[PDB]
Structure formats: structure tokens, C-alpha cells
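User: quick one - fold this with chloride ion bound?
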Amino acid sequence: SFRLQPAPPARPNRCQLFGPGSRPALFEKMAASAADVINLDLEDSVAPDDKAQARANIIEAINGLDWGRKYLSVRINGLDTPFWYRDVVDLLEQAGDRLDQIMIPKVGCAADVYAVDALVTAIERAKGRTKPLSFEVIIESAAGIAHVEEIAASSPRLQAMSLGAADFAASMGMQTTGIGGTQENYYMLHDGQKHWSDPWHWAQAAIVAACRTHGILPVDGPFGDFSDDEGFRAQARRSATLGMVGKWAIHPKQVALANEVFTPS
Amino acid sequence: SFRLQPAPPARPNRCQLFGPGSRPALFEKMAASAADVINLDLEDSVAPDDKAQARANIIEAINGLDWGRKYLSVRINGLDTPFWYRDVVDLLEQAGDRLDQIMIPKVGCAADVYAVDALVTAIERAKGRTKPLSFEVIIESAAGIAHVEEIAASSPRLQAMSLGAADFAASMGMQTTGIGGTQENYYMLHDGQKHWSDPWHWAQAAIVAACRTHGILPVDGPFGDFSDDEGFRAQARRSATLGMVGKWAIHPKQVALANEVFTP
Amino acid sequence: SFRLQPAPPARPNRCQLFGPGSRPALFEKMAASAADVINLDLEDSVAPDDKAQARANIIEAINGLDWGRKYLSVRINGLDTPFWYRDVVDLLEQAGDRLDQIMIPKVGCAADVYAVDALVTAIERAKGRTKPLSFEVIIESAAGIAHVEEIAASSPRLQAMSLGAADFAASMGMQTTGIGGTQENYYMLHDGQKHWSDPWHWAQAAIVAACRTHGILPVDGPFGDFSDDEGFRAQARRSATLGMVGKWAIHPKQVALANEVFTPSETAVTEAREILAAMDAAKARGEGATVYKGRLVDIASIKQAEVIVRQAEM
Amino acid sequence: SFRLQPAPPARPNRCQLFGPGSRPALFEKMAASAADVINLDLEDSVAPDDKAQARANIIEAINGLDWGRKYLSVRINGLDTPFWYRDVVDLLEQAGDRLDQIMIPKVGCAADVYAVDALVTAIERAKGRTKPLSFEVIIESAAGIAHVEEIAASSPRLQAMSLGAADFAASMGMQTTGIGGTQENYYMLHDGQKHWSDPWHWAQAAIVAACRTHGILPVDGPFGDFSDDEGFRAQARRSATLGMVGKWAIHPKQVALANEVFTPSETAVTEAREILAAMDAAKARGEGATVYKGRLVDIASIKQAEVIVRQAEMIS
Amino acid sequence: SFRLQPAPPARPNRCQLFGPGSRPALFEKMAASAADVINLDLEDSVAPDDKAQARANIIEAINGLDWGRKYLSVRINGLDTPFWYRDVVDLLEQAGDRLDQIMIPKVGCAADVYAVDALVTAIERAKGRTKPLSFEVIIESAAGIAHVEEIAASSPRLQAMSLGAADFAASMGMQTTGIGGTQENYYMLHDGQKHWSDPWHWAQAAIVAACRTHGILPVDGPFGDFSDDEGFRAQARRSATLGMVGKWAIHPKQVALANEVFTPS
Amino acid sequence: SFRLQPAPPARPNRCQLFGPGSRPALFEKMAASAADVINLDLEDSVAPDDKAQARANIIEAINGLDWGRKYLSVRINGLDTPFWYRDVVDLLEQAGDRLDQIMIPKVGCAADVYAVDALVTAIERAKGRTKPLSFEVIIESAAGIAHVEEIAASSPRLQAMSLGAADFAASMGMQTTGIGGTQENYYMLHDGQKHWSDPWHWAQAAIVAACRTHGILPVDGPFGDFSDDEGFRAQARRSATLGMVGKWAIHPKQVALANEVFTPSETAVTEAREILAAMDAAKARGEGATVYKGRLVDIASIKQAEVIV
Ligand SMILES: CCC(=O)SCCNC(=O)CCNC(=O)[C@H](O)C(C)(C)COP(=O)(O)OP(=O)(O)OC[C@H]1O[C@@H](n2cnc3c(N)ncnc32)[C@H](O)[C@@H]1OP(=O)(O)O
Ligand SMILES: [Cl-]
Ligand SMILES: [Cl-]
Ligand SMILES: [Cl-]
Ligand SMILES: [Cl-]
Ligand SMILES: [Mg+2]
Ligand SMILES: [Mg+2]
Ligand SMILES: [Mg+2]
Ligand SMILES: [Mg+2]
Ligand SMILES: [Mg+2]
Ligand SMILES: [Mg+2]
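Assistant: Sure. C-alpha cells for the protein plus chloride ion:
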């Protein structure tokens, strides 16, 4: 089109704070946090038996709580589960206009996003919803990274893409520990001395390139070690250096760390 | 894999009898016909205001009537409508195991079929349905025929593909109001005399090639003029010659005509 | 996208009148013709040594003549020629904003259109042109028909696509006579009796499908026999039936013929409106299907009737 | 690349005469025929128990017989059979330089041709063969026509592509009779009258488009009715009209019929020369517009004249 | 498919032990080794004049020796050589059912594997072979890594995919020394201090992603320095961390090292 | 094709020396340098108001100066600018046969190169230019790296491909300092200590793979810190290791540094010739593999040693 890359969404995304839908007592705290994006979770932080109740809890929270200027997103279950369709139907039929975004996990190709888009669009039209939802996806599988560009171009709704390093590692068969960060066995040996390198380099850089090509925000995923502030800082700094615009917080203390690294200047 | 093309489903598909879901009085008449496949319709034979009730009737018929050995299909609404998702959700959640198949209309690419497959599969798993549904699709748009092969390879559930000449003509901007058959203004002029040619040749042939490549049944669609048996025979014969295995009946009289042409 | 297929340009395109840019004495009459689109030619109707002058003539006509409500287009030389870049540079630098469109010949892939788009866009920006040109292309080669869909989706500027039967046949190695129309040696023999069929069926239909998929106007090309009005009517009727919206006029006589065919007859229109009324009545009765003159009509029939109507309301 | 479409091989291909490799007595007659291309068959005209012997026969025929100016091709068995690899290996290891080409049947995708190319290339290198083989392929399946362009672009060796109407119809599940030609049940009905149309239109046109896009010769396949001479002519004329350059002969009578349709008449050649001479004379006087008897000539009208003259000189 | 990614072959592949077919006196030591996979070589460890004899040796070895529970593979010559067809023809026509697998070198596209598949399938059918051969391929060229996913999906026979660092480096025009491992000239300079990084990161990660997407086993290739046990461990650990399941042994004492790193807990 | 990968152009490309077309007083110094390739710039080193003059300057320099055996290239403006078409038209219509190459910046897809190829080919035919121009491109955007293989295969004119790390970083939204090199915030933390890693790894390797697949020269782009020779050396050495054959010089002093790194050392070539000799001896006694200094060495090492020599 003889201008370069499309501009990404202008909204801040320095930090996405996650909380399980099964704990409504956390919602007001999340709303009061310094996080730019709130992720209410129906997926991995919620046991299968609790998913139906968590779904109801989230719908009530969306309709009943003051979320301020925060971007409100919900991580639904995967398309390889029986839960995902009910997540989408109930959310789009019952949740009010305050809902901003849906997060789709384990995306492995463009058609996965198209599928959710097909369903979401129909319900929006059926219910006469005035504010169209945006999409964000998680790259957390071999298929996801292998198909990262087609996924980035898969929907006009798409605004963000996250790397889920833990589930990515599991999918890739990576012999890693914890969630993200330095890996003990990934180092170069030179004259008896060890130098640790970045085992996530390609996955992060490819995600960034795919996102920037198609006007999407690339985002860094969870970091597991809550007691390692400097580990988080290093991980976030690497991601920012590679072009990512923010990082998940799965613990309240991580929000300040993410804001420290990702706030522009 | 260095073998011949995939084998198509072995089930009979000589004729598919259509009937609006808003006319439940037709259902037992359809069930008693000589049609191999029964298509209960929620789409273009049903007014928008009646689609919700038509859906309720179809579910009742699936759980209520004796369909014998018929292949029981339901044509849902298109993905560009607000009706399609409720069609699928209600059917898979409420209809018993007698439902065999759903027909997806106005398919423009493989992702459309993938989208329905995503939804259907999740509900089957959630409800523990023992008999997985098959799919059939209609090629009835410009995009459809342009992407016919990718559509033919779009799902393991896919068993059949029909050419819908009515919507196809509209989408293509074809100057006509008739449904299939001979076109008055499509002829060759040689030394004063006119010779009428087949305006549907490529569409049908492309569909057959796509279907045979991927082990799918290619089917001819609706013939509008139910007062013209010889017109129907001509259309059905052309389709058979091109490799299609059957044809829709949109009226009881057409069922006998279809079986005449397509019975091996 | 989950929407209707992209709507084509609403502008009329029933007839495209061609005229060599080397003959400016005809320009005035073309402007006063009944053609919806005017095509001033720099390509095959102009000898190589006459191209430079024809280029200057066309630019002068774009700036000087009153073209009324005509859609003004120029056919440039192909990307396989040394002429094309000078055609585009001179037109975009020297011609005023009355120029609407350029026609690109012998298009074989999406990249050909993109190449012209790249040049045109840079010059429009450099000169600050206020009305961006639209593109139309000619499918007149084997490569063209084989890659027809990618060509249809090659540029936001693209508004129309023509089948050039004479050059298509040459490229395909077709043993044909004249330009388009019935071919003597293309017939079916049944019981010693011959039945002529359409040797252009796939090319036309595939172009229509590609165009309609991407919101482009499919157009029929030149018909060579100027003395055969009924032959022209036959060719135009086949095109209109397959979905094409208009046809070239390479002779002033053909303009009236094109407009007659590609404007829906009064009989066809009245039938379309009755079907709409019949379907509208069935809706109020709570039915999506009913009977019209002994044949089935339904919701899909509404959209077919709407095809006939909007072309007549043009 | 900003030039005209790739030029096809500059050799005549009006008729390809087939003969089973199990019948070596026919070989000298084929070599003496008026066919441009000779196809010795290892495939469907040869029974499974005769395939090994036919392979030996063909190899001897290539090494021992005088084939004159004929383009010598061998149709091997398909990649879905246990025979194909043995066909290629024995041919490329044992046959002399006189072998020009191999024909690959039932090609469904580009990778089928690539597979054969990989094998053929390695044996040519191992044996030090001096004249590399060209390929030709048969489109005779649904997969083949669906993937026709990718097949056309599948190999630098590829020179020709045929439509096998009978096997194509069987693959497509077409309810047809015989091999090619008019089909009884494929007609248009108007006012009680029937008009028969072409049930092979797209298959033929698409093959021609794919071939001409990639510099390949598009060829029409077998016609079954050996007594229907006018049926053959009609089929050949349709093919010629759609852009095919030749047709198979599976019976010696068909050779004359094929050459008749695909050779320009002496009248057409003469008129073509005159038009080109008129143009040349005009340019000699520095004129851009040519005039022949009647009026003015379109550039496409001289384009075909040059094609016709080029044809006549290819047949010497 | 709305299911998890395809499961890889279940068989062990911690170590692949290579040996030139031109040295049949070493075959019994290989059969007795602790390697899961045995690779009898007809390619780059056999001089051109010795290839015909090595072929006969291997065929005799397949029919003659006790291979126990070893997965028995043969690396044939590449499709750019005149040797490959004779390698495959003789193996499939003359070797018994003890042969498990063929290793295809220098694969640059999916069509390369299809070509070998076409030939193997024909002979298996002609000879009525009871146990169909599996395939493994080596990614050891620029074309290979560029087309790694299409190669991973190239055949139902494909079970494993190896990175060949020696040929890869040559094909890529890498100014490297030795085979794999730390590269002296690949380091980051920070405040007059050198930090060596992984010059093989993308190639290894991309291979793992392609393999896991399509149910293939990703394998690390040869490590040249025999005398460097710690260097081997470092290379093996990096590979394991990135998701590879095993590594070649081109010297007998590398088998134990590979098993130490790749044996699952 | 069943052959080895296509061979790249054989011409030297150890260093590409850039100079703005707006400063013709520096041209003669460039022609006197030890740089293999000369890049006269119409793009980012030239302000918009100077572009037309620089165009005229460059044309005069091409027709007027002695460039010896240098490969003479001109970096035109991008396809997203109004300047590019006039750069091409003027150069191809007015510059003499001494011009060798045009460098296209910000290439995002194959069609970009095709667009320039279409224009260049037509003018060459119109003017009857006897020496067809080659192309080189810069991968300096997200789209460029995502589509890097299709770009590398986009034209028979294409001979070289550069990574432009600064503009790449900007497009990618990378939080980096300077141009290329070590990045302060890109490090691994292990028990309290930091280990810096390569934030350009995939970009460089992917460019090399795309290039080598299609017979193109992969080249490393600008390095910003002119006072940091060791910094330059580390960057050049990483690139050479990954397979890049040369590096830009944007300051005159960088030419020697590029030549030093991208001319294989006598130590490296002696070790290569030593390996080749060892494998001749191995092959002579019926061995496809042998031992070299406690290391494995076989037929694969031959092509490796040949890359060196
Ligand atoms: C072209 C685009 C498309 O989408 S077409 C695909 C979907 N279309 C349809 O489903 C249309 C099906 N057709 C119909 O709705 C009806 O046949 C139409 C055309 C409306 C005519 O209905 P009607 O006037 O009742 O027919 P008729 O009087 O001639 O009835 C004769 C006897 O047969 C029955 N009948 C009628 N239609 C069906 C049917 N589809 N299936 C089974 N039976 C049918 C009628 O009851 C009547 O029977 P009886 O003798 O009273 O027992
Ligand atoms: Cl994760
Ligand atoms: Cl034309
Ligand atoms: Cl046949
Ligand atoms: Cl830069
Ligand atoms: Mg997860
Ligand atoms: Mg319809
Ligand atoms: Mg033309
Ligand atoms: Mg056959
Ligand atoms: Mg190797
Ligand atoms: Mg730049």
C-alpha cells in the first residue's frame, strides 16, 4: 500500500494483571491496581469443576464493578476444550458493554481466530452489541510460533499477542524449569567458563516481527518466580529490547516491575 | 499417498429433498418419500421472523418422527447472519442422535467450514454425543467457486458439496431470475440459427474435480421449474455426465425424476 | 469478514469506447457518444513511432476537452514494452484531474498491477493529485486467466477487468477466426448434425467469479465483426448472462448495441419487480418460499431480482 | 522477467502414435508412419504379466531400430504402481541415446514429476548419458486438473501435457460412454429441441492455459470410436480451437485425421505468407499500417500469420 | 483438528551412533553399544570409490548381524548425487525386514522427501515388504532451515529430523571452526569483556517447532571435538533445553554422554 | 534442480562505503578507499530539500569520476516516498554505463523489488543500456524480516541483501541504543551475574539462510559507535560467523575494520588447507572420514574449509 506498517492500538499495555474467575474477592483489588489491562481468567487458573461458576462470577463482575479506564479482557478456554463455546456464548449474551476484549489461548493457526470471530460476530449482531470486542491471542505452542505471522493477520479484531513461555516450553518439549527467564542448561562453554544465553530469543523476536508487520501489540507472558524481582526485570528488559510493549503480572508485586521497565520515556 | 484418490462416502445420495422448517406438516411426507437425503431448512425457504420457530420444529421432528433409513440433514443459516450460531447450539444441545448432518450455505472459504467445525466439535464433546455429525456445503457464490478446492479439503466431516445455482447466479451478477437450467440469452449464433450452450459448465466441473480429489460427493442443486420434467431431466443428465452423484428435490415430483437419472 | 461480498463500483460501465490517441479528430465525437466509459489508446491501435505524439494528444484532450459525465480512461502500453513507464509518467505529471483511470494491458499476475500502482502512487504524491486514479486491467493471456483471482485482488485502485479475446486466443494458441464470437471449428457432432458451443465459457466465467469475489466489474472485450449486429448481440448476451456488466466498442456502431444488451429489458425488469413483490407478500404471510409462474422462488430469488434491478436503475 | 510468455519447444507434435511394447512387430510400422511423435507403451495397453517383456522389447527397439526423425517417447507406469521405478531404471540404464522422452501417466501434483525427475537425473549422471530426456505428462484425474498449473511448472524437462479423457472421466465419476467426443446425456433443452455442448471444455482450456503460461505443449488425448472419422475430426477441431497443438492416435487410421486437422492448409499458409510479405513491404517503406486484400490487419492477425508460417516450416 | 498436537513416535532416540559402511569390522561393536539408533553410513564418511562396497557391506550386515533392539537406519547419499537411487534400490530389494529406517541427507524441500517416498513405496510394493520403512532427514543447508516446516510435514513415514551443523555451516557460509559447539568469534563485548552466545539458536529452535507441530522427533547432530566431554555436554544440554530429544554420536564415547543428558527422568 | 545451492556473485563485498550524494567533495576520497563497494546515497543521509541536487551530483560523479574497480551502487529512496521513481528515471536515463547497482531500502515484500524491476527494465530498453543493473536490498523493517525468503527470491537482478539494524529496531519497536552492537538491557541473569546475548541473532541468521538459498550475498549493515573499534570488531565477527560476507562502513575508518574481519586470516586459511590436505590423505587410503587434532573431519568439512579458502 506504499506506506509501511500499520500503527498498533494506541492504548497502553505495559502490564496485564491476571486473576482467576473463581476468586471474586480479588476483583476490586485488580481494578484498583496500576495495571493497564485486566485479565479475568476462565482457563488454566481455574479448575474444571469451577469453570461454570467462574464464568458466572466474571459476568457479574463485568456488569457490577467500576473498572475505571482499565482495558477489560477475559481469557476463555481453548478451542480443543468443550468449555470454549459456552465461555463465548455466555459472555457475549450476558455481559454488558464494559467488556473490551477476549483472550484466546493456544492459538495454532489463523483459522482458530477466524472461528472465534465467526461466533463472536454473530452474537454481537444478534444482541445488538454497540461496542465490538477486540481479540488478543497467546502463542504457547510449536504450531503457534510456526504459524505466527498468519495468526497476526488473522482478524481485524486482533490487538495483542502474548508469548506463553511455560506452555510453549511444554509444547516444544523444552527441558526447562519454572516459567520463562534464565535456564540453567542453556549456556556456552568457553575455556572452562559458562555464559548463559537467551533460550527464548527467536520466539520473542518472531512474535514481535509478526505483530509489527500487521499492526498488533506484541506482549511478554508470565514469569513464575515471584521472589525474584531481578529475574523479572531481566526478562522484561530482554522483551522490551526485542520490541515487546508489556508483560503479564500473575502476582500483584509484578505490576510495579512491569510498569518500571515498560513505561516509555 | 501413492494410491488412487480417496474413496467418497458409500451412502446413497441420489436425491436430497428440501422442506422449510416452518412447515412441519411436510415432515412425515418427506420421511415417506423416495429421497435418500432429507434436508430440513432453516435458511432461504424460511422467513427471518419464523426462523426461531422453524428451529424449534426441526428439533421436535428430529426427536419425534420415524425417519427410517433416511440421511437426516439440516441446512443452517449462513455465517454472515446472526442466526447461524443459535442454529448450531440448539441442534447439538437439544436434538437427539437421529440427526446425521448439517448443511452449511454460502461457504466462501475453508475457514468458514473450520468455524462451524470448531463449534460443533466442542458441543459434541460437552454433551457426549455418540454420533459425530457429517458436514455438507453449498458452493453458491463467486468466492465459493474461486476457492472450491480448499473448501473440499476443509474438514474430515465433509461428505458432500452442492452447487446452488440460485444464489450463485445472484452472486455472479448473472442476468437471470430462473434457477438452473437453460438460459435464453446463452446461445451460439451460426448462420442464422441459435444453439444453446451450458452456462454452468465450469462451475459444475470445478466442483466435481474438487470433490473427487478429496473424497467428497459432488451434488447438483435446486431446479426451479418444477412444472418442467424434461427441463429437469436435461439438467440432471448434464450433472450426471459431469460426475455429480445426485440432485436436490425442492418439490415431491422431482424426487422420482432424480432417482431415474442417478440410480446406478 | 462475515459480510456480503465486496460491492463493486456503482458507476455505469455498459460500454467502453476505444479510440487511438493518434487520431484526435475523433475525440470530440467520442465525448458526445452514448458510451459510459471512454478509452483513449496508446497501445496496439497506435504504431510505435506514433506513440509519443499520441501521448501528447491524449494529455491535451484530457485538459482541453469537455468530457461531460464520461469515465475517462487511457490504455497504456504493457510492462513488457519500453513504452509503459513514459506513458504513466507523462500522464500523471501532465494531465489534469479529469483523467479517471488507466487501463493496463496483458496483465499476467498481481505483481504487474502492483508495479504500476507503485509508480502511479509516487507521482500522485509528488504532484499532489487530489483524485487518485482507478485501475482496470485486461486478461488477454494464458498467464492472465491462470492467475485471474490474484489479479482481481491486486490493488484497491482496481475497478474493472476485461477479457481481450483476440490477444487471449493468440496467447493460448487458439485456432480462431476474427475476434470473439462463434468459432466455426468448435462444435459438437451429434447424428451427423453440428451444434456450436461456447469456446470462451471458462475464461469469461472465471473472470466474473474473480471480479465478483473482490468487488471488481467484469467486462467483455472487443467483437471484431462490425457488420454482424446479431453476432454482437449473441456475444453480448452470453457475457451479460455469465455476469459481465458491459462490453468494448471498437466501432461507433457497437455503442448502441452494447447499451441495448447491458441495460435490462423492460420485460426482465417487470419480472424482477414482480418476484420481489411475490416474495414480499410471502414474507407477510410468514413464508420464505412460494410459487411464481409454476416455478420456485425464495430468498435467493430476491437477490437475483436485485441484480436485474440495480443494473436497470443505473 | 518482463518478456512474452515462455516459447514452447520448437518441434512438431500434431500426432502422437501409441503402440503397446508387447507387440514389437508393430514397431517398424510406427517408425514408418506419418506421426510426429511415437509413444511405445508400458502402461495400460500392456497386461501386468507382459510388462517386463514389453520393457525388454522397447529397450531393444530403441537400440536397434531406425526411428528417422520421429520424437521417440515411452509411456511408463504410474507412481501408484510397483512398476514405475523398474521402467525408469531399466530404460535409463539400458536404452541408448535415441530415446527422447518419457510420458508420466496419472500425474496429480508437481511432486509426482519431481519424483521421476530426481530418479531420471541421478541415473543420467551415473550412466553418463549425453542427451537428457524430456518429460511429458497426462492429466487424467480430478487431482490432475485441479493442480494443472503446478504440474505445468513442475520441471524444466517438461515439454508436453495430454488430456486423457477416458481415465479422466472415470476419476471424475463422469457418466460417459466411449473415449472423449460428444456425450449423449450432455445437451441443452430449448423448446423441445436438444443442443449438445462440450463436456470437456474446462479441462481442455485449463490445460491449454497452464501449458502456455509455462512454455509447454498442450495435447489432446485418445478418441475411442475408430469408425467415427467425423467424430474424430470434430473432437480434434474443438481441441485445435481451444489451443491444443495435436492429438493422440491409438489406431493407424487416426494419424492422417490428426495431421489433417493440425496442419494448416496450403491455402492458409499462402495467405499467411502474403500478409507477412505485405507487412514487410510496408515497413520497408517506413509505414506502420499494413494492407492486404480487403483492408487493414490487426497485430493479432499478423501474430497468427507468423504462427501459421512457423508451423509450416516446422513440418519442413 | 481441535485436538492437541500430534504425538511423536514412542521409540527411544537419545543417541544415534554413526559408522561408515566401509568399515564392517566395527558393526558388531555398534550393535552391542548403548545407542538407541544405529546409523550405517553410505554418505559423507565413505569415499566415493568405496560407496559401492560399503553398500554391499551394509546389506550383508542388515541380513547377517544381531541388532537386538536397536533401531536400524541407513544414511543414503543425497538427491544431488548419482549414488542415491542405487542406495535405495539395493537396500529395498536386497535387505531383509530388519532394516527400520532410511536417513535422507541435505533435504531442501518437501519434494525431496516425496521423491524418496515415491521410490521406496514402489519397491516395497513390488517386493511385498512386510515392515514399511520410516524416514529421517537432515537439515543441513540454508534451503533446509528456510523450508523446515514444509519438510517436517512432507511424509507419513517421517519420524525424525536432525540438524547437521557441519554441512549447515558450510551451506550458510559460516566462518566457523570444528563441528557445532561454541564459536570463538560469536560473542558479545560489554565493557571490554566477552560473552559467548549461541550461534545455533534459531536453527535448533525452528527445527524443534517444525517437528513438534507435525509429530516428528527433533534431533541434534554431530559434535566434532572428541576430546571435549564438557563441550559435548554443553551442546547437548542446550539442545535438550530447546526441545531436542537426542544427539548423534560420531565417536563411541559420545554415546554415554548423550544418554546422560537425554535419558528421561 | 538436484544441484548444489546457486553460487552467489563472485565479486568482493567485504565493505560497502556509504557517502551522501549531497557532498560531492567526498566522492574522490571514496573512490580512493579500500572499500569493495561504493554506495552513493539519495536516501536518509540526504535531507528532502537536497535530494534533487544529490541526484544530479551522483549522475555527474558516475559519468565524470574514475571509480577504478569499485562496484558502484546508489541507494534510492523508498517506495513509500514520492522521490523513488524520479531517482530511478533520472539515473537510468542519464547515468552512463559505469553505474553497476541500485540499492532499494525498506523492502517489505517481493513485489516491492518487482515494482522497481519493472521500471528499471523498461528504461534500460528505452535507452538501450548495454549493462543491466544489479539490485541490492535492505531488510530494515518487521515486514522485511517476516518475508525475507520471498524477497531474496524476488529478482534475477538481486545480488546482495543488508540488515539495517537501526531502522529495523525502529520498525520493530526495539528499545535499543545506538546502531547495532551490544544492547545494555539484553542479558541473562545467573546467580547475580549478567551475561549479554545477541539481540540480532534471528534477524541475521534468517537473512543469511534466505540469501544462501537463492544465491544472494548476505551483508551486515551500519554500526553506530565510531569510537568503538573493538565494538565494531565484535559485531563484524558475529556476522561473519553467521555467514555474512561483509559490512557497511559509514565512517572512513570502518573500512579497514571490515576488511580485517571479512578477509579470512592466514591462521584460518592454513587450518582450512590443513583440513583439505588431511582429507586428501584420508580419501587416498579409502577413508571418507579421519581425525584432525582430536576432532572429527569428513567430506562435510571439505565444503567448510572451501568457504574459508
Ligand atoms: C433456490 C434456492 C433454495 O435455497 S431452494 C432450497 C430450499 N427450498 C425449499 O425447501 C422449497 C421446497 N418447496 C416448497 O416449499 C414447496 O414445494 C413450494 C414450492 C413452496 C410449493 O408448495 P405447495 O404449494 O404446498 O406444493 P403443492 O401444492 O404442489 O404440493 C403438492 C403436495 O406435496 C406436498 N409437498 C409440497 N412440498 C413438499 C415438500 N417439500 N416435501 C414434501 N411434500 C411436499 C404438499 O403437502 C402436497 O401434498 P398433499 O397432497 O396435500 O398431501
Ligand atoms: Cl505460559
Ligand atoms: Cl483482444
Ligand atoms: Cl484416457
Ligand atoms: Cl539501519
Ligand atoms: Mg496457557
Ligand atoms: Mg442458496
Ligand atoms: Mg491487447
Ligand atoms: Mg491412462
Ligand atoms: Mg552432512
Ligand atoms: Mg534505512
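One thing worth noting: The domain at 1-309 of chain F is CATH 3.20.20.60 (TIM Barrel).
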